[PDB]
Amino acid sequence: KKCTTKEDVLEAVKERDVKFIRTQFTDTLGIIKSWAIPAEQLEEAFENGVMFDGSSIQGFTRIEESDMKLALDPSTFRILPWRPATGAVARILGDVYLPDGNPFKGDPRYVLKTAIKEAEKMGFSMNVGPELEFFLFKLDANGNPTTELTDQGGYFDFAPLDRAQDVRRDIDYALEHMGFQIEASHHEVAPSQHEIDFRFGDVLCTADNVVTFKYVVKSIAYHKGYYASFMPKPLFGVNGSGMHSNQSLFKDGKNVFYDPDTPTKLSQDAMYYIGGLLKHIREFTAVTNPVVNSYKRLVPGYEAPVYISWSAQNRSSLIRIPATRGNGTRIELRCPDPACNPYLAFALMLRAGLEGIKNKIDPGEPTNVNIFHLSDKEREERGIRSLPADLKEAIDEMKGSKFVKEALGEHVFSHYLCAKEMEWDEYKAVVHPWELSRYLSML
Amino acid sequence: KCTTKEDVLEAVKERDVKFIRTQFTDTLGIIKSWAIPAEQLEEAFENGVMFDGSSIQGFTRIEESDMKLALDPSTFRILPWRPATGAVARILGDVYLPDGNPFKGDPRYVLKTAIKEAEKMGFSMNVGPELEFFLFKLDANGNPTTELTDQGGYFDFAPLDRAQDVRRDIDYALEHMGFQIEASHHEVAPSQHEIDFRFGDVLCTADNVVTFKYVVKSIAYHKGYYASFMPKPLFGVNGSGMHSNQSLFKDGKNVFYDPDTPTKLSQDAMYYIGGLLKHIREFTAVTNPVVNSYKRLVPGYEAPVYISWSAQNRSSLIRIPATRGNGTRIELRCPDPACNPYLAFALMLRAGLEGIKNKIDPGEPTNVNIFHLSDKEREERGIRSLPADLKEAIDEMKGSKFVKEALGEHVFSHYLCAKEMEWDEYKAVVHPWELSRYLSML
Amino acid sequence: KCTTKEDVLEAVKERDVKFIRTQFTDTLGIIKSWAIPAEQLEEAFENGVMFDGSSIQGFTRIEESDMKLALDPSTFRILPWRPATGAVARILGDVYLPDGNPFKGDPRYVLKTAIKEAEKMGFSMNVGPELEFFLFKLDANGNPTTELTDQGGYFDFAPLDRAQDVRRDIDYALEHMGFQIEASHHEVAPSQHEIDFRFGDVLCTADNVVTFKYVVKSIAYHKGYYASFMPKPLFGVNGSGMHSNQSLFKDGKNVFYDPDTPTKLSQDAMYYIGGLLKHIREFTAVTNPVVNSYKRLVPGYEAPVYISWSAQNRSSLIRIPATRGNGTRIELRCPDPACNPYLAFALMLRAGLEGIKNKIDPGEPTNVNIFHLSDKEREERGIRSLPADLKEAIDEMKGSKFVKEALGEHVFSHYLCAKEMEWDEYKAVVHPWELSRYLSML
Amino acid sequence: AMKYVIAMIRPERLDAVKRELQKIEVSRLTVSSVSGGYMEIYRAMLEKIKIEIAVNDEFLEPTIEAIKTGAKGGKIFVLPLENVIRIRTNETGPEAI
Amino acid sequence: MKYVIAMIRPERLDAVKRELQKIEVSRLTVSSVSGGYMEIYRAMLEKIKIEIAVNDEFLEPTIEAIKTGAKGKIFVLPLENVIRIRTNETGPEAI
Amino acid sequence: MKYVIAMIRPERLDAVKRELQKIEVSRLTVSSVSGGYMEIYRAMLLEKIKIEIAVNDEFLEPTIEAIKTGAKGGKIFVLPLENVIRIRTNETGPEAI
Known part of the structure; x- marks a missing residue:
């Protein structure tokens, strides 16, 4: 049954011996945040809100407002798929308020809700189906994460068939009976790599679910003796991990990307939505691909795209349009990796698409050729631009962008860019073992 | 018997089936799968399932990659393990392009076309396959090795230790998903085993050979061992083959049997053999698919490296067992377990059919030891060899119109480009045998 | 008792038997088997089972190899372990050529012809064998070793640690399969044991020596130990024999007993001893079949290396125990537990029958210690010794018309060609002992 | 009236009984691992399952044959059940099962 | 006399016992048995069987103690006899 | 009819099973159960053995004294059991034990 009121939640806590409640939120960068509330404190939390330190979201960097209130949302209450001896555990989410009663604009979830409100002002709602690729590694003798493989299978192989076969099934079962409604899962291209495909769904509940997925999957794997890694590129020379984001807009339950009267059966407003996405994706690549290691995945030779193009036929464009029509018409954006903040990243896809629809942004021609095999002049003649090559280059693009600044809000915009600037400055000064291998003998 | 999607959904509910697995192969015989939650199954039966065709045909080309699997309810089978989370089952189906026509690059589709062509003459094919594997140890980290589990030989009662129980559990698991073993025995090499399955229609049999490999492997892994289907994992002992016994039936009767001929074989039996002998060189690349396959096809062991048929010599490339009647059969001995069985059985079927349509004489049987003859002696007999390595098998197949039409152009070309890349990789490797032979010498 | 195939099918249903194993031997004694699912068994009773006859006769020649096993229900016996999967049984039978004639190359067939020969003269033969073996430890990988489980001696109460339970479990397994053990004891060497079969009908007893070997081995393996039937695993201690007590019967009376003679032995017993001595030299290659057999046949231990008969002396090649009446018996001491019991008993039966036919007097007993004598004394006494190594035993057998006609030519030549190969391999080996003696000297 | 039915089965048949119990909608059941000369040969190399079901009288024989099938x-041992109390509902008697 | 069989959640076993002792009922028989709340948990139901032989006056106190x-669920069965062995008492006094 | 339940010191399970067979009682069922003399030992309720037997009225006295000896x-519980049915043979009451 569906939890709608706090009394539904409080009744369900009683009936199922739920002993601890975990809040679930993200900081600016997409790190999963939480704290533990005993069941005994929960009714008061529904009454007065819960005070907490906003530095958890916005960092310690600046003197700003820091005592926030979490107004719990009973419809986000969901029992977690493990039963400790101590009792059942659940998660819940909420809205963060400043002491004056105004919503805190720096919560990524509020940022998505404002994009939702914009789409609603135009009569639209957005669905998303994410595709989460990940790696299943071994723990070393101390229980630490490693990159040790659990299998050497490839794309859609029925692998692994040892003990890890049971762990993979466990992860699937836990999500399904949490209530995820997985559509499918397969082995992906690289050794020990996997993909679980979410059901298409309301964008807010989807972004909420992507965060929950990350730690449920890690906890299941850890407790079985394995490690689930959402690194974009843990291993050189094999495929990285992405989070392709299929999406569509609806006007009261009618897919707005479908139009049965056109030769492709795609609507005009679908193409404008693509045009807006292609117009701004460079300016927020730092959001969808947020760490240094993201751009080791954004290199040629694998499932990762590097060139800004759209296409139906070519399964490797940045924007790909599946063959499905009718209600399930969607466009797939392939560049994002799973290290991103899904709230900030879905919100900017939605804002970009809504601008393309509002401004009639023609996306141009589709690129059906292999873009890797082309020359610069051909790409230049085609006008085929490439995504930022590294995090610094992505940051600078974002820095100059008033679209991204408006969509995210100045708080989030500036907090994000400062911290990413600092991480690159830490990365750039490191002398890597590859440098000694190449240069120590030589120089 | 599973006949309808309503039979399946009821059995899924009744037997607590929580996960369904699809089951298919790519162009190169690799087994492929994805997992469907049992909550998705009713929608899957109604709408099909969309999946990436790069699973079957690879990534090397821009071609149609959005396929649809239409689930076939009569291929639903519960797997022989019971996880705490609930039961598991495998299912197959037919693959469709978005425009609604069948996808021709599916190896199962290639076999149906051979079945469909053979039905234009009123012929149907049965297969009883004999699968050899090695039961090896795992190392400390749970990974495969070639370390022996026993030192027994042909038809020995061995192992008698804990691996005695693994072998039994493997035979038990297959029998109780409905494989109907005829017999299993220890094979010539140490730690080598063979399971002989009952005769069935070639489509059911090819589906079951795919199921068998991952079932056997998963059972062995879960008991702490490894089941290996390499052709030649170990130098200087026997390799593993997939001998493929076959019968053709018409009007209910065995096409190969004739009670009135001296050997009690029908004429079409000899024509079927002639067709196989004519074309076998041209699809050794399919029945013997990897580089390691031609370390098994060297003289000295159970492997047949010469093209000939016989009833008397057990080691001829084509053998006729003494059984007559409705069980008259033809054993084609050269294949190994790495082959795509949909592609192998279809090519055998077409080749046999070609022999019957064009009345291809098989020539004389070879009743002697072909190894113990000279190179001129066998040329006196006109006895040819099977290709000596993968590159040679590739070159024989690239120039074959029979193979190209039987597989279709998409399969033919994909298969050849991939195998050509595999050989171009292997031929540049500097092996440790070369250092041992040459480092001091040169 | 199992009498009809319906008896066996009911027992399979009633006792939840899921696997039936066949049990036979090859020419050289190795124990052979293949597994049959219980679901296949009623068909197996109806039509027999086809199998490859290279399992018995080997691969080295082009000879008919499609054989048919017809199952003997009365040999159905449930094995003494109970997998969770369900019970296991063994069964034996008769091997036929595709024309319907019996296959003469099966050693059990060879025994059945000997039984027919004695029945043509009124007699049937009992045997009670005494099987010696070692119980050793397994190394860390579960591999056999020659590491000791006790330091005990003759008839000691030993071992007294975890190996005491394994030994008791071995006795229990055989007895409650229905062997009817008479007595078991620790034998002379450290870790050495002996189990005394029940004096029984020779055919059924030979079936039991084969079962005994893998039941004992498998029981010990699953307890962490190893049972070894090597004639001489350890230099400097007793080797392991299979002494073979035997008697003939006519009309239900023991024809070796004569109450009205001083020895209370009939004359036919003396002619039977006389025949055994006349031919024992010629089939030592069958009773003592491997290279190791002739490390046991050296002076200084329980092994008899001299041809003689005695009542008193326990040293003799043939000893006549004190028992009289219905249990009057002749003990032949040279065989070791590696022999093929089918062939070993058959040749024993034929040698003794030839003595009774030709009234071959055994000469005088030998009541002295033969090891203590000088060559001229033994020469004066006409006391000849056994073959001193396998090659000498091969040469003796090859010339023997008596062994050839008794075994049949196919078995005779196959046996000698395989032993000649084993000897040629051994004789070239440079052994560590040679490096120790000569490396620093030469 | 109502009854307590104790049934013991060899453990590999438990789930055939579960389904046959489910046929006439009987799912409220309790299963215990119990220890209760065919098997004499095997002592060098027997566990049952106890099932206990509360049924109303009208399901008496339908439950016996479901477990039978x-x-x-x-064996099945059927006992006199005087009363059954549901803790959450405080139901007593037939409505409690 | 009475034979009472109770299957309680294993988490509340001695809370039942504390209630049981307070009305001076102390001889019981504890055993572990097994009897879609818990489906979500199959990746990462067990009960406690309590058997009591009360008499017809501590009958309802025993039920309410286990109820409290x-x-x-609680099962009530007729107990016809009880034999202490180390004393050979039978009937109510043997309880 | 009777349903007999015996809670015995676990060390005497096989002593009673010896006296049980002597009077042709073979249908039993053995459980591990538990029910301040033992207080001193808690650093280093006590475990019993539960044995369930259904016997005819003619074997009731032999059954108990077999368990007593x-x-x-x-303690031996004697219960009034009204129904005992065998699973394979549709047996009832006195025929089913």
Whole structure:
């Protein structure tokens, strides 16, 4: 049954011996945040809100407002798929308020809700189906994460068939009976790599679910003796991990990307939505691909795209349009990796698409050729631009962008860019073992 | 018997089936799968399932990659393990392009076309396959090795230790998903085993050979061992083959049997053999698919490296067992377990059919030891060899119109480009045998 | 008792038997088997089972190899372990050529012809064998070793640690399969044991020596130990024999007993001893079949290396125990537990029958210690010794018309060609002992 | 009236009995691992399952044959049940089962 | 006399016992048995069987004790005889 | 009819099973159960053995004294059991034990 009121939640806590409640939120960068509330404190939390330190979201960097209130949302209450001896555990989410009663604009979830409100002002709602690729590694003798493989299978192989076969099934079962409604899962291209495909769904509940997925999957794997890694590129020379984001807009339950009267059966407003996405994706690549290691995945030779193009036929464009029509018409954006903040990243896809629809942004021609095999002049003649090559280059693009600044809000915009600037400055000064291998003998 | 999607959904509910697995192969015989939650199954039966065709045909080309699997309810089978989370089952189906026509690059589709062509003459094919594997140890980290589990030989009662129980559990698991073993025995090499399955229609049999490999492997892994289907994992002992016994039936009767001929074989039996002998060189690349396959096809062991048929010599490339009647059969001995069985059985079927349509004489049987003859002696007999390595098998197949039409152009070309890349990789490797032979010498 | 195939099918249903194993031997004694699912068994009773006859006769020649096993229900016996999967049984039978004639190359067939020969003269033969073996430890990988489980001696109460339970479990397994053990004891060497079969009908007893070997081995393996039937695993201690007590019967009376003679032995017993001595030299290659057999046949231990008969002396090649009446018996001491019991008993039966036919007097007993004598004394006494190594035993057998006609030519030549190969391999080996003696000297 | 039915089965038949119990909608059941000369040969190399079901009288015989069908391919002891109380509902008697 | 069989959640076993002792019922028989709340948990139901031989006056006190202690099913059967062995008492006194 | 339950010191399970067979009682069922003399030992309720038997009225006295003798060197419940049915043979009451 569906939890709608706090009394539904409080009744369900009683009936199922739920002993601890975990809040679930993200900081600016997409790190999963939480704290533990005993069941005994929960009714008061529904009454007065819960005070907490906003530095958890916005960092310690600046003197700003820091005592926030979490107004719990009973419809986000969901029992977690493990039963400790101590009792059942659940998660819940909420809205963060400043002491004056105004919503805190720096919560990524509020940022998505404002994009939702914009789409609603135009009569639209957005669905998303994410595709989460990940790696299943071994723990070393101390229980630490490693990159040790659990299998050497490839794309859609029925692998692994040892003990890890049971762990993979466990992860699937836990999500399904949490209530995820997985559509499918397969082995992906690289050794020990996997993909679980979410059901298409309301964008807010989807972004909420992507965060929950990350730690449920890690906890299941850890407790079985394995490690689930959402690194974009843990291993050189094999495929990285992405989070392709299929999406569509609806006007009261009618897919707005479908139009049965056109030769492709795609609507005009679908193409404008693509045009807006292609117009701004460079300016927020730092959001969808947020760490240094993201751009080791954004290199040629694998499932990762590097060139800004759209296409139906070519399964490797940045924007790909599946063959499905009718209600399930969607466009797939392939560049994002799973290290991103899904709230900030879905919100900017939605804002970009809504601008393309509002401004009639023609996306141009589709690129059906292999873009890797082309020359610069051909790409230049085609006008085929490439995504930022590294995090610094992505940051600078974002820095100059008033679209991204408006969509995210100045708080989030500036907090994000400062911290990413600092991480690159830490990365750039490191002398890597590859440098000694190449240069120590030589120089 | 599973006949309808309503039979399946009821059995899924009744037997607590929580996960369904699809089951298919790519162009190169690799087994492929994805997992469907049992909550998705009713929608899957109604709408099909969309999946990436790069699973079957690879990534090397821009071609149609959005396929649809239409689930076939009569291929639903519960797997022989019971996880705490609930039961598991495998299912197959037919693959469709978005425009609604069948996808021709599916190896199962290639076999149906051979079945469909053979039905234009009123012929149907049965297969009883004999699968050899090695039961090896795992190392400390749970990974495969070639370390022996026993030192027994042909038809020995061995192992008698804990691996005695693994072998039994493997035979038990297959029998109780409905494989109907005829017999299993220890094979010539140490730690080598063979399971002989009952005769069935070639489509059911090819589906079951795919199921068998991952079932056997998963059972062995879960008991702490490894089941290996390499052709030649170990130098200087026997390799593993997939001998493929076959019968053709018409009007209910065995096409190969004739009670009135001296050997009690029908004429079409000899024509079927002639067709196989004519074309076998041209699809050794399919029945013997990897580089390691031609370390098994060297003289000295159970492997047949010469093209000939016989009833008397057990080691001829084509053998006729003494059984007559409705069980008259033809054993084609050269294949190994790495082959795509949909592609192998279809090519055998077409080749046999070609022999019957064009009345291809098989020539004389070879009743002697072909190894113990000279190179001129066998040329006196006109006895040819099977290709000596993968590159040679590739070159024989690239120039074959029979193979190209039987597989279709998409399969033919994909298969050849991939195998050509595999050989171009292997031929540049500097092996440790070369250092041992040459480092001091040169 | 199992009498009809319906008896066996009911027992399979009633006792939840899921696997039936066949049990036979090859020419050289190795124990052979293949597994049959219980679901296949009623068909197996109806039509027999086809199998490859290279399992018995080997691969080295082009000879008919499609054989048919017809199952003997009365040999159905449930094995003494109970997998969770369900019970296991063994069964034996008769091997036929595709024309319907019996296959003469099966050693059990060879025994059945000997039984027919004695029945043509009124007699049937009992045997009670005494099987010696070692119980050793397994190394860390579960591999056999020659590491000791006790330091005990003759008839000691030993071992007294975890190996005491394994030994008791071995006795229990055989007895409650229905062997009817008479007595078991620790034998002379450290870790050495002996189990005394029940004096029984020779055919059924030979079936039991084969079962005994893998039941004992498998029981010990699953307890962490190893049972070894090597004639001489350890230099400097007793080797392991299979002494073979035997008697003939006519009309239900023991024809070796004569109450009205001083020895209370009939004359036919003396002619039977006389025949055994006349031919024992010629089939030592069958009773003592491997290279190791002739490390046991050296002076200084329980092994008899001299041809003689005695009542008193326990040293003799043939000893006549004190028992009289219905249990009057002749003990032949040279065989070791590696022999093929089918062939070993058959040749024993034929040698003794030839003595009774030709009234071959055994000469005088030998009541002295033969090891203590000088060559001229033994020469004066006409006391000849056994073959001193396998090659000498091969040469003796090859010339023997008596062994050839008794075994049949196919078995005779196959046996000698395989032993000649084993000897040629051994004789070239440079052994560590040679490096120790000569490396620093030469 | 109502009854407590104790049934013991060899453990590999438990789930054939579960389904046969489910046929006439009988799912409220309790299963215990119990230890209760075919098997004499095997002592060098027997566990049952106890099932306890509370049924109303009208389901008496439908439950016995359901367990009979699932288990045959053990014994059934049926006892007098005076009362059954549901803790959450405080139901007593037939409505409580 | 009475034979009472109770299956309580294993988390509340001694809370039932504390309620049981308070009305001076102390001889019981504890055993572990097994009896879609818990489906979500199959990746990462067990019960406690309590058998009591009360008499017809401590009958309802025993039921309410188990009803009380386990709150946070009960089966009642006729007991015809009880034999203490170390004393050979039979009937109510043997309880 | 009777349903007999015996709680015996676990060390006397096989002593009673010896006296049980002597009077043709073979249908039993053995459980591990538990029910301040033992207080001193808690650093280094006590475990019993539950044995369930259904016997005819003619075997009731032999059954108990078999359990008494083999257990003396516990407590025997005697229950009024009205129905005993065998699973394979549709047996009832006295025929089914």
